[PDB]
């Protein structure tokens, strides 16, 4: 120790791990106080040259804690996780967490789609076509008897067989509105700073999920729309004070956090469709540390 | 890369670097805006198991940032405390060095206090007292030895009243009490692992420079916090440390002390911008990142 895991081996090890299962466990443990989610810290480089965020997790029950450091340089974004022992204070693992991040994000949304989507859902929209959107598809393509799956990004008109080759039910829409038309579940998987979908423009109640974080107060629905949605999120205690649409809604549209009807801890320990349903994830250090730990236990 | 440097190798490379040099440059560099010193983060483990502190630094000059993590694991008769520094690249966002920072830390703590003693002690200061006799006290004694014409050096810990004879004779007396050790002292260096007061600046026979370094508890402090109201207060970095240093937090919360009485920090002292004297060090990530980066340059 410490084992140093570069990208290739990390991906090989990633493939041998049930991320949905690991995060499922992590949330029930968080619900029971067996894991602790510390605050993130963000530090700007001088002269616009970029930022870095440190994400933390304490897995008390497993006797490990960690930091993922993610620099954004000018646009290069990497991620590395250091796992430390709570028993002897020594480093266990230093792991390239670039792919681990993508997986946990999609698997976290996935857990929320499983807990929240109505059992008989048939139509799926994915907005965004990057790796996070593809992972989202990979991790939700089996959760329901989807008849139809729609995908839209701007760039998609102007490589297309990869996208349609991830599922036989997937077709490229020419517009957001086409993709989401008649959708039971809509997964917003974009880099967008600002709204990509108004829930007022829906033909029926849907489950809407959102993951965009790359911007100060980045958000994918209109902040006012939270007041018209049944609102869920990854963690009650952290996400409302950082999710852009949630801040803006509370500062300007009189939205109160107490309107949050459940987080994943509450959903997955059973403590938590006449209106649309909104699920917000912004990423939790605990997800990063859980995953790195799973690699560490696998690496032994 | 990344290189992993364990304890024994870290010490050897440490012997090859000029710590006071590096910290002098560093603190001038921080005053001039060329490096960022964000606040430390303390995270409690659940159920009284302990905590960790993460120290950050951006050395934008040398194209590196990093994080030193320091777990504090509660034990039966004393905490187990470690320190590992991860140094990252600002060009490609990859790790450069994961280094055991146990001894690096000891060195940058003593050297930080030596910078402070230089800039704050009377140029005609004669008698020196050191409270504590462990690794940190040994480092202090060896970094501050040629800063003044010391005519007497006294030293106290309750165990003396091994690896220090390795520093007794690395540079003069061992007192039988705290009081005896600090009689007529011009500079008193508190170099303990104490969580609470080891010296009351009100029982001194005359004014002195009093320095403090202990971080061996969430709010460790080596002087009664109320005493900060009767002392001219300086610290390593005024932007962050007044909000973490035990005695400053307690004084502010209960003794009506206010952080704006901080008459200077080290960036200010070593850029001529500053003004009984107390100096408080709790460690700063930049110091940690600077020293780690030195070891990385050596490879
Ligand atoms: N919540 C979390 O846990 C977490 C963690 C890390 C990252 N993230 C977020 O995940 C996002 C997706 O990551 P990625 O690697 O898949 O990124 P990416 O490769 O940059 O993909 C972004 C996608 O958003 C699409 N998009 C659709 N409508 C858009 C609109 N109106 N404005 C902007 N973009 C629009 C883009 O279309 P084009 O084809 O036209 O570009 C593109 O396909 C990141 O940008 C980040 O904010 C979330
Ligand atoms: N070690 C580092 O790298 C480093 C770096 C930055 C800050 N610090 C801080 O400095 C502290 C000291 O570190 P160290 O490595 O020198 O520890 P150490 O080797 O255990 O030495 C601590 C010394 O404090 C003495 N001391 C004197 N009066 C005391 C009192 N009233 N209560 C408690 N202790 C008293 C101890 O007495 P005995 O001789 O009777 O045991 C001992 O000599 C750390 O615990 C930490 O807060 C350490
Ligand atoms: N290892 C050090 C702690 C490192 C943190 C320095 N600010 C100690 O014994 O207390």
mmCIF file of N, CA, C and O in Angstrom, chain A residues 42-47 49-53 69 71, chain B residues 26 29-30 33-38 55-67 86-90 284-290 293:
data_model
loop_
_atom_site.group_PDB
_atom_site.id
_atom_site.type_symbol
_atom_site.label_atom_id
_atom_site.label_comp_id
_atom_site.label_asym_id
_atom_site.label_seq_id
_atom_site.Cartn_x
_atom_site.Cartn_y
_atom_site.Cartn_z
ATOM 1 N N UNK A 42 -13.811 24.270 -2.886
ATOM 2 C CA UNK A 42 -13.542 24.725 -4.235
ATOM 3 C C UNK A 42 -12.511 25.841 -4.174
ATOM 4 O O UNK A 42 -12.594 26.748 -3.346
ATOM 5 N N UNK A 43 -11.505 25.734 -5.031
ATOM 6 C CA UNK A 43 -10.395 26.657 -4.980
ATOM 7 C C UNK A 43 -10.115 27.068 -6.417
ATOM 8 O O UNK A 43 -9.982 26.210 -7.287
ATOM 9 N N UNK A 44 -10.073 28.390 -6.633
ATOM 10 C CA UNK A 44 -9.843 28.967 -7.945
ATOM 11 C C UNK A 44 -8.337 29.074 -8.172
ATOM 12 O O UNK A 44 -7.600 29.407 -7.253
ATOM 13 N N UNK A 45 -7.881 28.758 -9.385
ATOM 14 C CA UNK A 45 -6.509 29.046 -9.760
ATOM 15 C C UNK A 45 -6.395 30.551 -10.032
ATOM 16 O O UNK A 45 -7.388 31.196 -10.383
ATOM 17 N N UNK A 46 -5.211 31.185 -9.849
ATOM 18 C CA UNK A 46 -5.001 32.555 -10.315
ATOM 19 C C UNK A 46 -5.197 32.680 -11.823
ATOM 20 O O UNK A 46 -4.848 31.763 -12.574
ATOM 21 N N UNK A 47 -5.776 33.823 -12.229
ATOM 22 C CA UNK A 47 -5.750 34.308 -13.603
ATOM 23 C C UNK A 47 -6.552 33.376 -14.502
ATOM 24 O O UNK A 47 -6.074 32.982 -15.567
ATOM 25 N N UNK A 49 -7.225 30.487 -14.740
ATOM 26 C CA UNK A 49 -6.521 29.338 -15.296
ATOM 27 C C UNK A 49 -7.241 28.032 -14.942
ATOM 28 O O UNK A 49 -6.908 26.979 -15.496
ATOM 29 N N UNK A 50 -8.219 28.124 -14.023
ATOM 30 C CA UNK A 50 -9.157 27.050 -13.725
ATOM 31 C C UNK A 50 -9.543 26.984 -12.241
ATOM 32 O O UNK A 50 -9.241 27.890 -11.467
ATOM 33 N N UNK A 51 -10.228 25.893 -11.861
ATOM 34 C CA UNK A 51 -10.606 25.602 -10.482
ATOM 35 C C UNK A 51 -10.140 24.184 -10.124
ATOM 36 O O UNK A 51 -9.572 23.465 -10.958
ATOM 37 N N UNK A 52 -10.352 23.795 -8.855
ATOM 38 C CA UNK A 52 -10.394 22.391 -8.482
ATOM 39 C C UNK A 52 -11.402 22.231 -7.352
ATOM 40 O O UNK A 52 -11.539 23.115 -6.509
ATOM 41 N N UNK A 53 -12.114 21.103 -7.362
ATOM 42 C CA UNK A 53 -12.992 20.746 -6.256
ATOM 43 C C UNK A 53 -12.458 19.480 -5.599
ATOM 44 O O UNK A 53 -12.149 18.515 -6.303
ATOM 45 N N UNK A 69 -9.925 14.686 -5.680
ATOM 46 C CA UNK A 69 -9.536 15.984 -6.201
ATOM 47 C C UNK A 69 -9.785 16.019 -7.718
ATOM 48 O O UNK A 69 -9.351 15.130 -8.447
ATOM 49 N N UNK A 71 -9.421 18.689 -10.809
ATOM 50 C CA UNK A 71 -9.017 19.980 -11.345
ATOM 51 C C UNK A 71 -9.721 20.234 -12.680
ATOM 52 O O UNK A 71 -9.927 19.313 -13.472
ATOM 53 N N UNK B 26 7.953 31.435 0.012
ATOM 54 C CA UNK B 26 6.535 31.117 0.025
ATOM 55 C C UNK B 26 5.686 32.231 0.653
ATOM 56 O O UNK B 26 4.652 32.590 0.089
ATOM 57 N N UNK B 29 5.623 35.210 -1.396
ATOM 58 C CA UNK B 29 4.824 34.875 -2.564
ATOM 59 C C UNK B 29 3.322 34.919 -2.260
ATOM 60 O O UNK B 29 2.513 35.128 -3.166
ATOM 61 N N UNK B 30 2.935 34.686 -1.000
ATOM 62 C CA UNK B 30 1.524 34.617 -0.649
ATOM 63 C C UNK B 30 0.987 36.035 -0.435
ATOM 64 O O UNK B 30 -0.147 36.326 -0.819
ATOM 65 N N UNK B 33 0.100 37.752 -3.723
ATOM 66 C CA UNK B 33 -0.991 37.139 -4.472
ATOM 67 C C UNK B 33 -0.573 36.004 -5.414
ATOM 68 O O UNK B 33 -1.409 35.512 -6.169
ATOM 69 N N UNK B 34 0.688 35.550 -5.371
ATOM 70 C CA UNK B 34 1.180 34.576 -6.343
ATOM 71 C C UNK B 34 0.808 33.136 -5.961
ATOM 72 O O UNK B 34 0.921 32.226 -6.784
ATOM 73 N N UNK B 35 0.362 32.927 -4.716
ATOM 74 C CA UNK B 35 -0.153 31.635 -4.290
ATOM 75 C C UNK B 35 -1.440 31.837 -3.493
ATOM 76 O O UNK B 35 -1.622 32.887 -2.874
ATOM 77 N N UNK B 36 -2.313 30.815 -3.533
ATOM 78 C CA UNK B 36 -3.593 30.821 -2.832
ATOM 79 C C UNK B 36 -3.485 29.907 -1.610
ATOM 80 O O UNK B 36 -3.093 28.745 -1.738
ATOM 81 N N UNK B 37 -3.847 30.457 -0.438
ATOM 82 C CA UNK B 37 -3.993 29.710 0.801
ATOM 83 C C UNK B 37 -5.463 29.658 1.194
ATOM 84 O O UNK B 37 -5.933 30.501 1.964
ATOM 85 N N UNK B 38 -6.220 28.656 0.694
ATOM 86 C CA UNK B 38 -7.589 28.427 1.155
ATOM 87 C C UNK B 38 -7.605 27.935 2.607
ATOM 88 O O UNK B 38 -6.576 27.546 3.172
ATOM 89 N N UNK B 55 -5.371 20.187 4.372
ATOM 90 C CA UNK B 55 -4.684 21.437 4.105
ATOM 91 C C UNK B 55 -4.453 21.565 2.595
ATOM 92 O O UNK B 55 -3.922 20.649 1.970
ATOM 93 N N UNK B 56 -4.833 22.711 2.011
ATOM 94 C CA UNK B 56 -4.732 22.900 0.570
ATOM 95 C C UNK B 56 -3.739 24.020 0.252
ATOM 96 O O UNK B 56 -3.378 24.834 1.100
ATOM 97 N N UNK B 57 -3.279 24.027 -1.001
ATOM 98 C CA UNK B 57 -2.366 25.055 -1.466
ATOM 99 C C UNK B 57 -2.344 25.053 -2.984
ATOM 100 O O UNK B 57 -2.435 23.979 -3.575
ATOM 101 N N UNK B 58 -2.281 26.249 -3.584
ATOM 102 C CA UNK B 58 -2.022 26.363 -5.010
ATOM 103 C C UNK B 58 -0.699 27.101 -5.200
ATOM 104 O O UNK B 58 -0.607 28.288 -4.923
ATOM 105 N N UNK B 59 0.331 26.359 -5.621
ATOM 106 C CA UNK B 59 1.617 26.943 -5.972
ATOM 107 C C UNK B 59 1.607 27.221 -7.470
ATOM 108 O O UNK B 59 2.242 26.497 -8.219
ATOM 109 N N UNK B 60 0.876 28.263 -7.887
ATOM 110 C CA UNK B 60 0.628 28.508 -9.299
ATOM 111 C C UNK B 60 1.931 28.849 -10.016
ATOM 112 O O UNK B 60 1.991 28.745 -11.233
ATOM 113 N N UNK B 61 2.964 29.238 -9.255
ATOM 114 C CA UNK B 61 4.261 29.557 -9.829
ATOM 115 C C UNK B 61 4.877 28.288 -10.429
ATOM 116 O O UNK B 61 5.376 28.306 -11.551
ATOM 117 N N UNK B 62 4.801 27.174 -9.685
ATOM 118 C CA UNK B 62 5.541 25.967 -10.013
ATOM 119 C C UNK B 62 4.635 24.972 -10.728
ATOM 120 O O UNK B 62 5.063 23.851 -10.983
ATOM 121 N N UNK B 63 3.393 25.378 -11.041
ATOM 122 C CA UNK B 63 2.471 24.558 -11.819
ATOM 123 C C UNK B 63 1.905 23.361 -11.042
ATOM 124 O O UNK B 63 1.611 22.314 -11.626
ATOM 125 N N UNK B 64 1.726 23.525 -9.726
ATOM 126 C CA UNK B 64 1.286 22.428 -8.874
ATOM 127 C C UNK B 64 0.317 22.926 -7.808
ATOM 128 O O UNK B 64 0.497 23.987 -7.213
ATOM 129 N N UNK B 65 -0.685 22.098 -7.528
ATOM 130 C CA UNK B 65 -1.417 22.241 -6.285
ATOM 131 C C UNK B 65 -1.441 20.887 -5.579
ATOM 132 O O UNK B 65 -1.074 19.859 -6.129
ATOM 133 N N UNK B 66 -1.902 20.887 -4.338
ATOM 134 C CA UNK B 66 -2.055 19.634 -3.637
ATOM 135 C C UNK B 66 -2.879 19.775 -2.372
ATOM 136 O O UNK B 66 -3.383 20.851 -2.049
ATOM 137 N N UNK B 67 -3.020 18.625 -1.709
ATOM 138 C CA UNK B 67 -3.791 18.471 -0.492
ATOM 139 C C UNK B 67 -2.964 17.595 0.440
ATOM 140 O O UNK B 67 -2.466 16.545 0.031
ATOM 141 N N UNK B 86 -0.763 14.779 -1.214
ATOM 142 C CA UNK B 86 -0.932 14.495 -2.631
ATOM 143 C C UNK B 86 -0.706 15.791 -3.409
ATOM 144 O O UNK B 86 -1.399 16.785 -3.195
ATOM 145 N N UNK B 87 0.302 15.764 -4.291
ATOM 146 C CA UNK B 87 0.664 16.901 -5.122
ATOM 147 C C UNK B 87 0.187 16.644 -6.554
ATOM 148 O O UNK B 87 0.485 15.592 -7.125
ATOM 149 N N UNK B 88 -0.608 17.586 -7.089
ATOM 150 C CA UNK B 88 -1.260 17.426 -8.375
ATOM 151 C C UNK B 88 -0.647 18.386 -9.393
ATOM 152 O O UNK B 88 -0.083 19.403 -9.015
ATOM 153 N N UNK B 89 -0.760 18.057 -10.692
ATOM 154 C CA UNK B 89 -0.296 18.942 -11.762
ATOM 155 C C UNK B 89 -1.389 19.914 -12.215
ATOM 156 O O UNK B 89 -2.498 19.506 -12.559
ATOM 157 N N UNK B 90 -1.018 21.197 -12.327
ATOM 158 C CA UNK B 90 -1.900 22.224 -12.876
ATOM 159 C C UNK B 90 -1.808 22.309 -14.408
ATOM 160 O O UNK B 90 -2.567 23.052 -15.023
ATOM 161 N N UNK B 284 -0.339 25.410 7.529
ATOM 162 C CA UNK B 284 -0.963 25.936 6.336
ATOM 163 C C UNK B 284 -0.567 25.024 5.199
ATOM 164 O O UNK B 284 0.617 24.751 5.082
ATOM 165 N N UNK B 285 -1.533 24.681 4.339
ATOM 166 C CA UNK B 285 -1.321 23.769 3.231
ATOM 167 C C UNK B 285 -0.201 24.199 2.284
ATOM 168 O O UNK B 285 0.489 23.333 1.746
ATOM 169 N N UNK B 286 -0.032 25.518 2.070
ATOM 170 C CA UNK B 286 1.016 26.018 1.186
ATOM 171 C C UNK B 286 2.386 25.531 1.648
ATOM 172 O O UNK B 286 3.178 25.054 0.840
ATOM 173 N N UNK B 287 2.639 25.600 2.958
ATOM 174 C CA UNK B 287 3.867 25.079 3.526
ATOM 175 C C UNK B 287 4.007 23.605 3.137
ATOM 176 O O UNK B 287 5.069 23.158 2.704
ATOM 177 N N UNK B 288 2.905 22.857 3.275
ATOM 178 C CA UNK B 288 2.896 21.429 2.992
ATOM 179 C C UNK B 288 3.154 21.192 1.514
ATOM 180 O O UNK B 288 3.952 20.334 1.174
ATOM 181 N N UNK B 289 2.486 21.960 0.656
ATOM 182 C CA UNK B 289 2.626 21.800 -0.785
ATOM 183 C C UNK B 289 4.023 22.210 -1.250
ATOM 184 O O UNK B 289 4.604 21.527 -2.088
ATOM 185 N N UNK B 290 4.549 23.322 -0.727
ATOM 186 C CA UNK B 290 5.908 23.768 -1.030
ATOM 187 C C UNK B 290 6.927 22.653 -0.792
ATOM 188 O O UNK B 290 7.732 22.384 -1.679
ATOM 189 N N UNK B 293 6.547 19.637 -3.079
ATOM 190 C CA UNK B 293 6.971 20.019 -4.422
ATOM 191 C C UNK B 293 8.499 20.000 -4.528
ATOM 192 O O UNK B 293 9.035 19.610 -5.553
#
